[PDB]
Amino acid sequence: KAAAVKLKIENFYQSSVKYAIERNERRVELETELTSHNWSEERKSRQLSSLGKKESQFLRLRRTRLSLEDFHTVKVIGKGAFGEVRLVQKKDTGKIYAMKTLLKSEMYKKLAGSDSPWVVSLYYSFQDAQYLYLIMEFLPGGDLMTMLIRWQLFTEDVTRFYMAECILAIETIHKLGFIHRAIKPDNILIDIRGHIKLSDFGLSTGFHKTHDSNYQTWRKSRRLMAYSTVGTPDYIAPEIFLYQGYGQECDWWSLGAIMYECLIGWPPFCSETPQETYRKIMNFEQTLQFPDDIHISYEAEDLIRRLLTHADQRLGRHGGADEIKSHPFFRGVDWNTIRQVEAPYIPKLSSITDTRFFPTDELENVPDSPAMFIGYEYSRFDY
Amino acid sequence: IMFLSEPFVRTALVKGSFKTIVQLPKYVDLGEWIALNVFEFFTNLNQFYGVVAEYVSLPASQYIDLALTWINNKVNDKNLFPTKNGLPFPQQFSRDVQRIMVQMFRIFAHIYHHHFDKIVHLSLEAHWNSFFSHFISFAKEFKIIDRKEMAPLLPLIESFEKQ
Numbered sequence: 001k002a003a004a005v006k007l008k009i010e011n012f013y014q015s016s017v018k019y020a021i022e023r024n025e026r027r028v029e030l031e032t033e034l035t036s037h038n039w040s041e042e043r044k045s046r047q048l049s050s051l052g053k054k055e056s057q058f059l060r061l062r063r064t065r066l067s068l069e070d071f072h073t074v075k076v077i078g079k080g081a082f083g084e085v086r087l088v089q090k091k092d093t094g095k096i097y098a099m100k101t102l103l104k105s106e107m108y109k110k111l112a113g114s115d116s117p118w119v120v121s122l123y124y125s126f127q128d129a130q131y132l133y134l135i136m137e138f139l140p141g142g143d144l145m146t147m148l149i150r151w152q153l154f155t156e157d158v159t160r161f162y163m164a165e166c167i168l169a170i171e172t173i174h175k176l177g178f179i180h181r182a183i184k185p186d187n188i189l190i191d192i193r194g195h196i197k198l199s200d201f202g203l204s205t206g207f208h209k210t211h212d213s214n215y216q217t218w219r220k221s222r223r224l225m226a227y228s229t230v231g232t233p234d235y236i237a238p239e240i241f242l243y244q245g246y247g248q249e250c251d252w253w254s255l256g257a258i259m260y261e262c263l264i265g266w267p268p269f270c271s272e273t274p275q276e277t278y279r280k281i282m283n284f285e286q287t288l289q290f291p292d293d294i295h296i297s298y299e300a301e302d303l304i305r306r307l308l309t310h311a312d313q314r315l316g317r318h319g320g321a322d323e324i325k326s327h328p329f330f331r332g333v334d335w336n337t338i339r340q341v342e343a344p345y346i347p348k349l350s351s352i353t354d355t356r357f358f359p360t361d362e363l364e365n366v367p368d369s370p371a372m373f374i375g376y377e378y379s380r381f382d383y
Numbered sequence: 384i385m386f387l388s389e390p391f392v393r394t395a396l397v398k399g400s401f402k403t404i405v406q407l408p409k410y411v412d413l414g415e416w417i418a419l420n421v422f423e424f425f426t427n428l429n430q431f432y433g434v435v436a437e438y439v440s441l442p443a444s445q446y447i448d449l450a451l452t453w454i455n456n457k458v459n460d461k462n463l464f465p466t467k468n469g470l471p472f473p474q475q476f477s478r479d480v481q482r483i484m485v486q487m488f489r490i491f492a493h494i495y496h497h498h499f500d501k502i503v504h505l506s507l508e509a510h511w512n513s514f515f516s517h518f519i520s521f522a523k524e525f526k527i528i529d530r531k532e533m534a535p536l537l538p539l540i541e542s543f544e545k546q
């Protein structure tokens with residue numbers, strides 16, 4: 001009986017068909033998630049147990065609502081090009097919460113979840129207009145370059161502890177089909193128990209290309225303006241610049257750069273400028289020098305020498321993640337028991353707001369600000 | 384040259400699947416699952432009148448920002464909304480959404496009356512129906528909406544399968 005057709009002439013809803021193609025998914029999403037309800041009918045008749053009324057209770061959850069200023073900031077912690085990090089608590093409940101401010105647009109490059117023992121576990125995400133905001137588990141023990149400043153470690157069984165435990169830290173990274181490919185003392189955090197959790201590159205950007213063409217208190221000439229631009233080829237296996245390549249061997253190499261700075265106290269290539277690496281770091285071989293402060297074990301030295309060998313394939317293995325554990329440098333440990341052991345240094349903090357292991361100060365630069373509500377929908381549940 | 388009129392919503396033929404969604408899941412607190420479905424039905428309806436925005440059996444209307452943002456402000460009033468942990472709800476909310484599920488309708492069938500005319504023309508036509516069917520078959524499930532209230536949209540309600 002009925003008839004006609006086909007108008008679609010108006011500015012009006014230019015895009016408002018967005019309702020149509022969105023809601024379908026929200027309906028698809030609605031459906032499955034309500035058969036996600038049927039994680040019930042799991043049905044144990046198995047036990048002879050209670051009785052004892054109803055052993056089932058579930059809120060269940062909520063998809064809730066959010067904001068900043070629902071967050072009472074405790075203190076500042078760190079910064080970046082994408083954004084700024086912090087230490088905060090939730091104004092409502094109160095809690096130990098790390099806080100990551102970052103840049104959405106404008107930020108470029110416009111997969112995997114989580115977990116592991118060795119990695120800072122990301123809680124969740126939300127964003128306002130310009131900035132991205134995060135929560136991760138707060139790790140009270142600062143970062144590793146921060147520890148290197150206050151005392152440039154004299155190591156041995158201190159560092160024997162800090163590698164190993166870092167080998168395993170990367171172990172789960174590569175095991176999970178990843179290369180962290182950012183090996184930084186400040187990419188590494190120390191937990192309450194004195195052990196290590198590294199967050200991840202995250203993944204926040206930057207690169208060195210192609211090249212540039214121009215034409216004990218005396219050793220405290222470390223801490224040079226921190227960075228506040230960064231990053232240096234502290235590590236930067238020179239398989240990255242130049243071209244594509246690498247895999248794991250970038251990471252192990254990059255840990256040779258941290259072995260050095262732990263023992264004798266500086267990036268081997270310490271450039272005093274940004275671009276004396278690539279340079280030195282590109283080259284090495286000839287440009288890797290071992291000073292006459294002549295104390296080191298053979299085993300500690302030989303290790304940085306198989307670390308700072310190439311990414312080299314061909315005759316050999318590298319081939320790593322093990323053969324690496326095989327090294328005589330490591331007496332033990334059981335490679336498990338390391339998780340619970342006296343950490344040569346466990347942070348002494350009088351309270352839980354203690355920032356004592358982070359350098360407050362100030363800078364105030366995020367070349368962004370002009371200057372002048374979020375959502376939750378997931379599957380699983382924590383903790 | 385310069386004359387207008389009113390209504391006429393008819394008829395049917397739309398969208399997909401069936402039912403079973405609006406049913407309270409096993410062993411879930413009702414007060415939650417209410418707030419859930421209504422905190423959906425709002426944004427979706429507003430996303431639909433967000434399509435018909437401006438362009439102006441019904442009031443003189445074109446108020447509806449006055450009517451909807453009453454609810455936009457009232458869904459953002461935290462004290463009716465069990466956000467925190469296990470922190471619970473008044474259950475005097477019965478007066479609240481026996482009012483509030485049905486405020487939504489008064490825009491709903493208002494769109495259906497006069498402005499479901501344009502709805503078709505978009506060729507969104509079939510979404511409005513099952514979404515309304517879902518809003519309804521939620522309300523007809525829980526008696527959340529009173530019966531006498533439903534008069535103007537009753538014809539579309541007569542449909543093949545809704546609830």
Ligand SMILES: Nc1ncnc2c1ncn2[C@@H]1O[C@H](COP(=O)(O)OP(=O)(O)NP(=O)(O)O)[C@@H](O)[C@H]1O
Pocket residue numbers: 077078079080081085086098099120136137138139140141142143182184186187188189190199204231
């Ligand atoms: N949960 C935490 N525990 C300890 N330190 C943290 C925590 N969250 C953030 N930080 C600090 O924030 C600093 C830097 O944050 P980060 O995400 O690394 O900035 P970035 O420029 O994005 N990444 P990177 O270049 O490796 O520093 C770290 O070095 C830590 O000092």
